[PDB]
Design a binder for this molecule. Structure first.
Ligand code: CL
Ligand code: CL
Ligand code: CL
Length: 129
């Protein structure tokens, strides 16, 4: 599913991501924009052989199981395929664990490089939330 901007903001809010660990909704929408362009089915293969999955490009080295990332963990206790669903529940619940792991949203390098320090509220501007 490719979400609309406000549609995704609303779904993220419904799932308790808004201001989670102090990160406003615009931060999460911005991260999703640059990680996946709001496409739940986004996948990307990393140089180390791991893969990133879903709207927030969650990585199989630590967070989910895909059966083909040697030496990896599955800390969200989910198949990586669950992160591709039209229902963002699994991605959100896993993101909550990731952002609580110590480095906040810096875990998403694209958030650090493209969202951090910017006017992230622009991502939810106009949205009925
Ligand atoms: Cl915001
Ligand atoms: Cl594996
Ligand atoms: Cl980047």
């Amino acid at each position: 599913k490719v979400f609309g901007r406000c549609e995704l903001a609303a779904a993220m809010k419904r799932h308790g991501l808004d201001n989670y660990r102090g990160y406003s909704l615009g931060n999460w929408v911005c991260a999703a924009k640059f990680e996946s362009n709001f496409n739940t089915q986004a996948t990307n293969r990393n140089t180390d052989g791991s893969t990133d999955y879903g709207i927030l490009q969650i990585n199989s080295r630590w967070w989910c199981n895909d059966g083909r990332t040697p030496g990896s963990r599955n800390l969200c206790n989910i198949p990586c395929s669950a992160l591709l669903s039209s229902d963002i529940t699994a991605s959100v619940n896993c993101a909550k664990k990731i952002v609580s792991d110590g480095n906040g949203m810096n875990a998403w390098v694209a958030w650090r490089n493209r969202c951090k320090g910017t006017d992230v509220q622009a991502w939810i501007r106009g949205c009925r939330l």
